[PDB]
């Protein structure tokens, strides 16, 4: 997601 | 989906502790997530206090470091907030929530007022000649008024402070085919355990 | 920290209306925003995160788009329950931030206040209080005036208003106004009223009552 395609996760939190 | 609700005091004293807990059900906080401590100022401004996550690494607000721990009790499936050395600056709506994507399950929410006031109960007075319920001289915030067990669907005034004290009331709407019929208001305050009646 | 401009601030539409809400940011955060609601009882729901994707249940008239710094939230066809207060967060940095909010009201026809003026009980003049109440019910739009009169002479200090939120029901407004005084001052008088001016009626609504 956003900029990219990656999406990943920080102490449970989803991220761009 | 995820049940979150907040418990603990409604009256926290300046120089003290602010301590809430959320009870989280549906779901093991072990399992996945970060869960958040989120506040709510009178004026409606939101703050992010901190989070523990489900492995218990936490991240707080700068703003707040030095005088904050978010803590678990896996066992209970239980979370815990800790404020220490509050001030009035404190008072807000407390809520806990899940952040996994964005921000989906909210407990409904607790209100923490800090001052060093007393606790008072309510000196309701009756309000007759549309009709209604006078809640005079209370606090801290905590009042709920009930018209004929739920039977009439009315006016709900928030409180104001008058003297360091609080002051709402309440109005009801019927056709003049009763007040004939009866009219009473329920008036419950939680943090007195007194439903201060009255009543005609 | 991410300072976050949410706009507008409040807003007056009509069911069926497709409205948008926006959000800036002071730097880009990579579609790390989520969408909140917040209704009447005070209670928060998700909508939207990273900027687009719906959260568990959330009906498609919500939707959102944006990047870097600016983004939308958007609600078609303006559903009854779609009237409540909604905030953007950040998640891009620590510590996270919000919005500050956007209040959608339902638009209405004007209507006139009923007007409805009380006495003090007997409970309260044994304390040695007496408060006079006036009710002030189901008007829009939310702006009203009341004015407070002892023996015709206009009383501004001892004067408590307040305002309800939007009726879920009629989409109405109501105001209740409580003047007190002491025992003793209230019974050297005997004419109390209340007068009401609102956008609506040439001459104000009066309300009063005397101690005979």
């Known amino acids: 997601c956003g900029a990219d395609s990656y999406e990943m996760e920080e102490d449970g939190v989803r991220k761009c | 989906d995820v049940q979150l609700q907040e418990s603990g005091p409604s009256l926290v004293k300046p120089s003290q502790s602010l301590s809430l807990t959320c009870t989280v059900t549906g779901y093991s906080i072990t399992s996945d997530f970060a869960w958040n401590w989120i506040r709510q100022f009178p004026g409606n401004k939101l703050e992010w206090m901190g989070y523990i996550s489900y492995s218990g690494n936490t991240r707080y607000n700068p703003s707040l470091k030095s005088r904050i721990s978010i803590t678990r009790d896996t066992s209970s499936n239980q979370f815990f907030l800790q404020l220490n050395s509050v001030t009035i600056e404190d008072t807000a709506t407390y809520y806990c929530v899940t952040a996994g994507r964005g921000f989906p399950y909210w407990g409904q929410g607790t209100l923490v007022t800090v001052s060093a006031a007393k606790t008072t109960p309510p000196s309701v007075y009756p309000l007759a000649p549309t009709l209604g319920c006078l809640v005079k001289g209370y606090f801290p915030e905590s009042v709920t008024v009930t018209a004929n067990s739920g039977s009439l669907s009315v006016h709900t005034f928030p409180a104001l402070l008058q003297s360091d004290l609080y002051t709402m009331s309440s109005s009801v709407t019927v056709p003049s085919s009763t007040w004939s019929e009866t009219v009473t208001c329920s008036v419950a305050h939680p943090a007195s355990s007194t439903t201060v009646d009255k009543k005609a | 920290d991410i300072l976050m401009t949410q706009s507008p601030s409040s807003m007056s539409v009509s069911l069926g209306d497709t409205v948008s809400i926006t959000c800036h940011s002071s730097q880009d955060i990579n579609s790390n925003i989520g969408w909140l609601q917040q209704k009447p009882g ?14 568990d249940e959330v009906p498609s008239r919500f939707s959102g788009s944006g990047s870097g710094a600016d983004y939308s939230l958007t609600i078609s ?20 931030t919000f919005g500050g909010g956007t209040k959608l009201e339902i638009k209405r026809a004007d209507a006139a206040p009923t007007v409805s003026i009380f006495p003090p009980s007997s409970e309260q003049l044994t304390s040695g ?8 019910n189901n008007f829009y739009p939310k702006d009203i005036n009341v004015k407070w009169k002892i023996d015709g002479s206009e009383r501004q200090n001892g004067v408590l208003n307040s305002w309800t939120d939007q009726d879920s029901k009629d989409s109405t407004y109501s105001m209740s106004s409580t003047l007190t005084l002491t025992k003793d001052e209230y019974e ?17 609504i009066v309300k009063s009552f005397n101690r005979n």
Not at chain 3, 77 to 90: K, T, W
Not at chain 3, 129 to 136: D, K, Q
Not at chain 3, 189 to 204: D, I, L, R, W
């Open chain 3, 188 to 204: 050297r008088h005997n004419s109390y009223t209340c007068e009401a001016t609102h956008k609506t009626s040439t001459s104000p």
């Open chain 3, 42 to 55: 005070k209670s928060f729901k998700g909508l939207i995160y990273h900027g687009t994707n719906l959260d």
């Open chain 3, 129 to 136: 209080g007496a408060s006079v109440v006036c009710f002030l």
């Open chain 3, 77 to 96: 066809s303006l559903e009854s329950e779609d009237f409540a207060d909604y905030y953007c967060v950040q998640y891009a940095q620590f510590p996270w």
